[PDB]
Design a binder for these strands. Structure first.
Ligand SMILES: [Mg+2]
Ligand SMILES: [Mg+2]
Lengths: 65, 151, 78, 116
RNA sequence: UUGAGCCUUGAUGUGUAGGAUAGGUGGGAGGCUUUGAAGUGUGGACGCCAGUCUGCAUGGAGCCGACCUUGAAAUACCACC
RNA sequence: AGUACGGCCGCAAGGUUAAAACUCAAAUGAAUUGACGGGGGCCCGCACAAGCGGUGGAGCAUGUGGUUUAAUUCGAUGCA
């Protein structure tokens, strides 16, 4: 959020502040989702994520580069 | 187009002046395959401009060209079902081509005398930042400035 | 004429098939209709410019001279 | 006049507009400019350029005050919430620091329904 | 905190020609400044942009009239203006 | 047709229990091959884009439709 420049920067990077959500939470609290769309959304969110790990787990792949 | 990178045709140098720059101009002014007519008009018009400018033959052509060749242009570049023209830069090769086409089109307008004079007038006005061609380059330059938001 | 009749005349001039030469001192009225500028200058030179007032000013800016002060505002009294 | 030395530049970046206000440190507005009212009314006022112009238009009309340093406060999700500090810096100002004062509720008022 | 008026104190008056921003008649002679300058450095204001008025600093005794070829004369006071 | 009628429950909205006449030769589940999507990915080509030149306006030529005719012989009817 706040950033101090010290003597020489010319380069103020608080756009590097993505550790704070800001954009991701402004884009989300800007609309009423549902009581249960987020429940469905998060279930979809990591039903896909676990599968991606169930693919990364299979690292013994064929097909000769 | 879709698949390849097409080749070039390398053009042939202008007879009277050993520059292929004027040869492409003759080709643009060409209509109906009548190249002898096209070169005859260009030679006569560029000669009667030499009496109106002072520069010999080719400098007085480039200083006209450099005035009407644009730098940026707007093209339809929709993304999300859009209807706005994104201003984009013009490659150096197209800059000469767009300049010649604008000069010839303006010369086919402004009907005053035979084609010899109409061409001769337009290059003289281009050489002094005044003609319809140099006005057209300003119209596209002004249409790109109005659209400078989109990049 | 007032602004209303001025606007009516400007519209009528725009919806004209023929051609017209209008002498005026109203820059705005001349700009809203003129397609060719015929402007007088000193030493009896009448510069002719094909285009409207926007592109006339743009041409002057393209080939301009460095100053901006016309008047002196001399006086009346004494 | 009043020769204020250290000012505060407030960037109100919305999805549809950008509003720039340079105040003093106590919140008294000196001048303001908007992307929409800076000749971009339409679909071009929601662009990072239109916010950059509004910052030039707002750096102008506060030159009467001789402001040297600027504490920048950004607020809102918007295209011009970054293309505005660059214009403020390019207008001779010395950006003292930058702060993102964007109101995030701690799960408070219910937002509107989404548009289908 | 203001608005209006009045009295004072300042500040101010680019035509052309003229040495250079010349308000009006003055009415008179030289005063001015040395109660520290004709200036240089500096800060603001006016600016018909030529420029003259200004708060300062060591240095502090020289700036204009008078001379006239301009319709007029030289901030060289207090004036009622 | 979880409808009507009758009970019971409810302030109501209605809930629950719960048919028949009549009518059809099916309705249905999963999966398959296609086709299609204002689904996604990749690729193409005068498909667009970049150009040049046309047609649609005018005269005439020619073919067609229609309409006329004693007959306007028959056939070809989106692209094809
Ligand atoms: Mg029931
Ligand atoms: Mg019942």
């Amino acid at each position: 959020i706040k950033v101090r420049e010290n003597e020489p920067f010319d380069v103020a990077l608080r756009r590097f502040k993505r550790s704070c959500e800001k954009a991701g939470v402004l884009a989300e609290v800007r609309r009423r989702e549902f009581y249960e769309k987020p429940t469905t959304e998060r279930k979809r969110a990591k039903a896909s994520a676990v599968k991606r790990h169930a693919k990364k787990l299979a690292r013994e792949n064929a097909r000769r580069t | 187009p879709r698949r390849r990178v097409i080749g070039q045709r390398k053009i042939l140098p202008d007879p009277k002046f050993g520059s292929e720059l004027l040869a492409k101009f003759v080709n643009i002014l060409m209509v109906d395959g009548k190249k002898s007519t096209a070169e005859s008009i260009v030679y006569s018009a560029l000669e009667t401009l030499a009496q109106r400018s002072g520069k010999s033959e080719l400098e007085a052509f480039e200083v006209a060209l450099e005035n009407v060749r644009p730098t940026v242009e707007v093209k339809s570049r929709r993304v999300g079902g859009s209807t706005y023209q994104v201003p984009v830069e013009v490659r150096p090769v197209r800059r000469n081509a767009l300049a010649m086409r604008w000069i010839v089109e303006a010369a086919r307008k402004r009907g005053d005398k035979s084609m010899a004079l109409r061409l001769a007038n337009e290059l003289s006005d281009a050489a002094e930042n005044k003609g319809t061609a140099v006005k057209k380059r300003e119209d596209v330059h002004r249409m790109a400035e109005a659209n400078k938001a989109f990049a | 004429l007032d602004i209303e009749t001025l606007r009516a005349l400007e519209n009528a001039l725009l919806e004209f098939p023929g051609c017209a030469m209008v002498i005026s001192h109203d820059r705005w009225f001349l700009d809203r209709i003129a397609t060719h500028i015929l402007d007088y200058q000193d030493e009896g030179k009448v510069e002719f410019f094909e285009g409207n007032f926007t592109e006339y000013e743009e041409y002057k800016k393209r080939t301009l001279g460095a100053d901006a002060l016309e008047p002196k505002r001399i006086k009346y009294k004494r | 006049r009043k020769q204020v030395s250290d000012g505060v530049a407030h960037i109100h970046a919305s999805f549809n507009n950008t509003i720039v206000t340079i105040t003093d440190r106590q919140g008294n507005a000196l001048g303001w400019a908007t992307a929409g009212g800076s000749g971009f009314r339409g679909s071009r006022k929601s662009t990072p350029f239109a916010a950059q112009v509004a910052a030039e238009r707002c750096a102008d009309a506060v030159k009467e005050y001789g402001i040297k340093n600027l504490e920048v406060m950004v607020k809102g999700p918007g295209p011009g919430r970054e293309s505005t500090i660059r214009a403020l810096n390019a207008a001779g100002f010395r950006i003292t620091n930058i702060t993102d004062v964007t109101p995030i509720p701690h799960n408070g008022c219910r937002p509107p329904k989404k548009r289908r």
